[PDB]
Design a protein around this nucleic acid. Structure first.
Lengths: 203, 50, 333, 171, 126
RNA sequence: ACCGGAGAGGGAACCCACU
């Protein structure tokens, strides 16, 4: 039976659902229920690696549910109550990689033999999984923004110059004069983009 | 506006169409002293004011 | 950053990041110029306006003409010690440039400081880097910058150019091995500049420079005047093409000409789709009439120039200082 | 789907537009404000064919602005969960295919793409093709499509489509 | 609740008159001719251009009188108003195709009549 | 742009006083 939640308690919810074609309210304990959803409704990711992202669920599997994000059309597979790693287990989406001796990038799409990588210049390149090396992320990096504030990984900044001027983002990685940022509203490149640190200001 | 706030028969603020408020009493840069037909100017009380 | 000369790569020219050496080269420049603050010690010319052009009548002036060039002071310290300093205080080391002493051609020049522009110059369809020597501050520690600009121009000919042509005639200097040509910017007196503006050079001139005869001075020189056509004429405008339609007003799209450090639209431009390409980009504009109009877009620059810069350029363009306007003003003296 | 509906809107006029031609300026303001606009409730407003009625404009107290309640006939585009319309390809990509419908742009995903439509990176234009090599889906092709879900982005509507359904493919 | 198959439409949106690609083109071309004349008017939107070229490439029959003829003949037979335009835009060639594309007609009318209507539609196709 | 002109500066209670 599927129906909509009238009220809620912490354990036996005594969820009082109004089931389709049922005017009566029943009671169910939480353990007896799951969050169903036909394909095409909007969903939010409540908790997980993806939490905060939204999308329309295209297909529902046993306990599996797949959907496309609103920001980017990059696929997502999550549990009904709510992997993120490439085949081979060496790399995962959003990780910093060394493209060649001088160039770093962030993986923004996983393909069967290749990654799409947003390089430090703002271009997206396609590379074979083995053609890039996993780079040790410096979570304690510090840089200066446009007003000489210290900025750090996790900081929220506004972009005040350059191509992404007007955007807002979370600092994910820092390298020399470059910052890789994430904004969930940006559907391009899974939300990732790159800005000069002098084009940023701490929000 | 050129007289400004210091001299009595003058203005205190000049309000532009965007709603930006310029304060005339603290060193206004000669660029924004210029005004167009849409703006509002907050002159001092003068003779004949009701 | 440090791009020595943009548009051409130059062999053997090498920027310097190593603090023991870099720190000195910068310092021996302050020293030679008798320079006060931090940063670039060299003379900074000022834009000619309706006030300025007056000085042309108040003393003697020589005129040469402005080429788009990069400003570099060349420090010649020894046999392999040759450095370039830019408006930024960035330092480069030039490798195969050699400066013979007029007296002993086996001896090399030391404690010398020159002022000049680095200019790409295409001849025979090909891009040849040149360094034009437009002044000399110090020669073998001799304080030549204290001499008369005519003395200094002559110094440059005899102490720098002529020795090198001499070693060239003998094959002991191969013009071919050297990173770039080395020349003295030619200067003429005021009257001859008139001819420049029956002008068949009417395209090739980015402007004129008016050089007083007095001793060299560092920093801001209100008496060295750069003149540039106002047509070309001329400030870096940060543009936001904006659909500004006020409440109750028909929506309108306009281009807001922002400047550096002033939060409001400094001016407005006749926005156009053929100007829409450079959305949110730094641009130069020409104030021929009451309308600033676009010539070229500067991808290199990221920040608009300062509000005081905008004021100075507006005053200068309001009083158009022309070559004939200052020619007589100096000819009276 | 394309429709012909009558809509209600109120436009404020600055006192400088009163002039000798106020109604023409009212028409121009309504056009410039509701031409190319998008609403999640009513979809794309493509064009206004005529203005049914222009009501009495009320002078705002303390403000020079006057608002006119305006009746106008406009043609709208708001797609369904469950409608089928023909679409045109704009981009072939490994994540999915980008196709263009009217003003709106929707994408078909690989898992929604039937498994017969194999990828051809190596074809000079990237292609969607069968093992039998019969059906060639390529750039600028016109295709049938089944739009399942719609999203609103900055008051602009984007949707998503399905292609599993029978007969639904290249024209 | 809004489903094209089961014919649920918004109450505010229930009474709207549905349109064809060809008649949308004639209206948009009329607007284009109106705007190109009587100058000093705003430039048409990218949405307008996209819809115009879409309905140009998707125009079934160019003739204006054909639009009225097909509208009248199909409305004479008792069908829901939403179905007229979708059927005339899709232009199925077989009644099985028509019922597959629009499930509402499945069981609404017999195969022979549905195919006769479709054949008339292709007959007036230009 | 070297800082961005930052001004907003508690409150409750009682007392005295003014018209």
């Amino acid at each position: 039976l599927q129906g909509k939640i009238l009220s809620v308690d912490g354990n036996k919810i005594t969820i009082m659902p109004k089931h389709e074609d049922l005017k009566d309210m029943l009671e169910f304990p939480a353990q007896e229920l799951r969050k169903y959803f036909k394909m095409g409704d909007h969903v939010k990711v409540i908790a997980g690696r993806f939490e905060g992202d939204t999308g329309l669920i295209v297909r529902v599997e046993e306990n599996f549910v797949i959907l496309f994000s609103d920001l980017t059309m990059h696929e997502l597979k999550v549990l009904p109550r709510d992997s993120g790693v490439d085949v081979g287990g060496q790399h995962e989406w959003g990780e910093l990689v060394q493209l060649d001796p001088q160039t770093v990038g962030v993986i923004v799409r996983l393909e069967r033999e290749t990654f799409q990588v947003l390089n430090m210049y703002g271009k997206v390149v396609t590379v074979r999984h083995q053609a890039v090396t996993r780079k040790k992320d410096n979570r304690f990096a510090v840089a200066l923004d446009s007003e000489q504030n210290n900025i750090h990984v996790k900081d929220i900044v506004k972009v005040i110059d350059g191509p992404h001027s007007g955007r807002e983002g979370e600092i994910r990685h820092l390298f020399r004069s470059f910052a890789f940022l994430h904004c969930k509203k940006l559907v391009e490149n899974g939300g990732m983009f790159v800005c000069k640190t002098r084009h940023l200001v701490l929000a | 506006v050129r007289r400004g706030n210091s001299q009595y028969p003058g203005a205190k603020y000049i309000i532009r169409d965007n709603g930006d408020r310029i304060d005339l009493r603290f060193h206004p840069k000669p660029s924004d002293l210029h005004l167009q037909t849409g703006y509002k100017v907050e002159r001092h009380m003068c003779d004949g004011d009701i | 950053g440090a791009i020595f000369l943009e548009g051409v790569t130059v062999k053997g020219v090498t920027q310097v990041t190593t603090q023991p050496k870099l720190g000195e080269v910068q310092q021996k420049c302050h020293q030679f110029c008798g320079w006060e603050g931090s940063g670039f010690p060299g003379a900074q010319p000022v834009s000619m306006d309706k006030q300025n052009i007056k000085l042309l009548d108040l003393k003697p002036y020589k005129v040469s003409w402005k080429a788009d060039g990069t400003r570099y002071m060349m420090l010649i310290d020894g046999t392999n010690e040759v450095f370039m300093i830019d408006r930024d205080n960035s330092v480069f080391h030039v490798s195969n440039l050699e400066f013979p002493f007029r007296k002993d051609l086996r001896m090399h020049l030391s404690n010398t400081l020159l002022d000049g522009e680095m200019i790409i110059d295409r001849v025979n369809g090909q891009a040849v880097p040149r360094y034009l020597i437009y002044d000399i501050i110090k020669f073998n520690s001799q304080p030549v910058g204290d001499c008369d600009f005519n003395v200094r121009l002559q110094c440059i000919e005899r102490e720098i150019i002529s020795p090198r042509h001499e070693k060239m005639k003998t094959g002991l200097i191969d013009k071919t091995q050297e990173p770039f040509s080395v020349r003295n910017k030619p200067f003429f007196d005021i009257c001859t500049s008139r001819k420049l503006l029956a002008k068949e050079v009417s395209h090739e001139m980015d402007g004129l420079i008016f050089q007083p005869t007095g001793k060299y001075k560092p920093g801001r020189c209100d008496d060295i005047l750069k003149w540039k056509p106002p047509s070309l004429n001329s400030v870096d405008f940060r543009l936001k093409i904006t659909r500004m339609g006020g409440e109750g007003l028909l929506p309108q799209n306009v281009g807001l000409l922002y400047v550096g450090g002033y939060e409001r639209p400094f001016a407005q431009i006749k926005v156009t789709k053929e100007l829409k390409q450079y959305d949110n980009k730094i641009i130069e504009c020409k104030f021929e009439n009451n309308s600033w109009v676009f010539m070229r877009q500067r991808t290199d620059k990221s920040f608009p120039n300062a509000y005081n810069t905008a004021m100075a350029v507006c005053n200068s363009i309001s009083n158009p200082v022309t070559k004939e306007m200052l020619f007589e003003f100096i000819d009276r003296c | 789907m394309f429709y012909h509906i009558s809509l209600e809107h109120e436009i404020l006029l600055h006192p400088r537009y009163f002039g000798p031609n106020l109604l023409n300026t009212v028409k121009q303001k309504l056009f410039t404000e509701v031409e190319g606009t998008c609403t999640g409730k009513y979809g794309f407003v493509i064009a206004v064919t005529t203005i049914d009625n222009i009501g009495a404009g009320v002078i705002q107290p303390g403000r020079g602005f006057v608002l006119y309640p305006v009746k106008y006939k406009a043609i709208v585009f708001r797609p369904f969960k469950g409608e089928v319309v023909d679409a045109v390809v704009t981009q072939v990509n490994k994540v999915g295919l980008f196709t263009e419908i009217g003003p709106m742009s929707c994408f078909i995903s690989r898992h929604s793409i039937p498994s017969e439509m194999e990828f051809d990176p190596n074809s000079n234009p990237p292609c969607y093709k069968t093992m039998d090599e019969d059906i060639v889906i390529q750039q600028d092709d016109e295709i049938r499509l089944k739009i399942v879900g719609t999203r609103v982005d900055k008051n602009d509507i984007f949707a998503i489509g399905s292609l599993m359904d029978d007969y639904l493919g290249l024209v | 609740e809004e489903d094209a198959s089961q014919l649920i439409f918004p109450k505010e949106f229930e009474t709207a008159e549905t349109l064809l690609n060809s008649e949308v083109h004639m209206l948009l071309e009329h607007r284009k001719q109106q705007n190109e004349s009587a100058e000093d008017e705003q430039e048409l939107s990218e949405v307008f251009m996209k819809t115009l070229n879409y309905t140009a490439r998707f125009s079934r029959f160019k003739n204006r009188e054909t639009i009225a003829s097909v509208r009248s003949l199909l409305l004479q037979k008792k069908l829901h108003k939403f179905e007229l335009a979708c059927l005339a835009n899709l232009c199925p060639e077989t009644a099985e195709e028509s019922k597959a594309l629009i499930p509402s007609l499945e069981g609404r009318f017999e195969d022979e009549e549905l195919q006769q209507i479709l054949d008339d539609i292709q007959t007036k196709r230009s």
